Every structure is written in structure tokens, then in C-alpha cells.
Ligand binder design. Structure first.
Ligand SMILES: CN(C)c1ccncc1
Length: 185
């Protein structure tokens, strides 16, 4: 792909984070802690899952960023509406305001409803995410495999400002402690 020149500097919004997450000083890395991280509750925090939003809001234009997923067993990545539900249980779907892919149990899937199987020959260590607001497109790229396409959501109905979306996943297995990292431009 040739989307790299739309690169944006994403930072994580502490206020939106699940209370077990640990975000680095530079706001560029996040991991699952082994306990509550001693923050007050607020209506922005994702309560049920290890999720956090980027601080940046997008309502026009083309945007690109990259995320490092090295040695993780589970994660979700993409974008979402600023007004997605924070509390309780929900599915990641465009109907609920999410445009995402994930790794789960050794398979990759796109967060359609129902979910869609992805075909990845080279397990990615870094994921590229491209948003074209005007066109209604969200695309995912395999940076480890020379930028090959993973998935395109088209005919997107964003219906609001968009925020970068992250889920570090649970660590029930003891094999999923590694962070998500926003990669330098
Ligand atoms: C429904 N399902 C298998 C998942 C959804 C989101 N992230 C991971 C898995």
C-alpha cells in the first residue's frame, strides 16, 4: 500500500482505559496489569474488557497508524465511534459502532456480524490501520508481510467522530501479558 504519508501520531486516553490497564508515560504503550491500577471510576472507562481509546478524534480526511502486537495471543484493533457503549457486555460490530479485527485462539477474524474469517499466511507482528472518512473505508495491512491487505470494511456508516480503538485481551493463559505499542512514524 501507499497510505504511509497519511501517518498520524496516536496517543492513548488514560481516562477511557479499563481500570486494570497500565499505559506508559509517553501514552504510546498499554498492557494488562495483574490487579486494579488504583484509579477512580468514571463513565468513560470500559468496565468489562481490557479496552482503551486513542485521544485523537477524526471527523474527515485520511488517517494511518501502526500497532505492534508481537508475541500476543489475543487482541482487538481498529476504530470506533466516540459514543460506543462503555459499560456491560457488547459485541464488536459496525451496528454497535466498531470497525475492528482480532486475534483469538490462533485465528484472525474481522468484527462483522457475524464475524468473518481472515486468511493470513504470515502472522503479523505489526498491523497498519487506514481510515478514509469521506469514502467510508477502514482497511488493515500486514506490515510483517510487506504491507499485504488483511481486510477492508467498505460502505461504512461511521455516524459520528471516530477514535482509535484497542483491546490488549485478557491474560488467563499467562501467555498474553505483552503490550500493544504504537509504532513510530
Ligand atoms: C466473538 N469472538 C470470538 C471474539 C470477539 C472479539 N475479540 C475476540 C474474539
Amino acid at each position: 500500500h501507499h497510505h504511509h504519508h497519511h501517518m498520524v501520531h496516536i496517543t492513548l486516553d488514560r481516562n477511557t482505559a479499563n481500570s486494570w490497564l497500565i499505559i506508559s508515560k509517553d501514552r504510546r504503550q498499554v498492557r494488562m496489569g495483574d490487579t486494579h491500577q488504583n484509579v477512580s471510576d468514571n463513565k468513560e472507562r470500559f468496565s468489562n474488557y481490557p479496552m482503551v481509546l486513542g485521544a485523537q478524534r477524526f471527523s474527515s480526511g485520511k488517517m494511518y497508524w501502526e500497532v505492534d502486537v508481537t508475541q500476543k495471543e489475543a487482541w482487538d484493533l481498529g476504530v470506533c465511534r466516540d459514543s460506543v457503549q462503555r459499560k456491560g457486555q457488547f459485541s464488536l460490530s459496525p451496528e454497535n459502532g466498531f470497525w475492528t479485527i482480532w486475534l483469538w485462539q490462533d485465528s484472525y477474524e474481522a468484527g462483522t456480524s457475524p464475524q468473518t474469517t481472515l486468511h493470513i499466511q504470515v502472522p503479523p507482528c505489526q498491523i497498519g490501520i487506514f481510515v478514509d472518512y469521506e469514502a467510508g473505508v477502514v482497511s488493515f495491512y500486514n506490515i510483517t508481510d510487506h504491507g499485504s491487505l488483511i481486510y477492508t470494511f467498505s460502505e461504512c456508516v461511521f455516524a459520528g467522530p471516530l477514535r482509535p480503538f484497542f483491546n490488549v485481551g485478557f491474560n488467563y493463559s499467562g501467555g498474553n501479558a505483552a503490550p500493544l505499542k504504537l509504532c513510530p512514524l
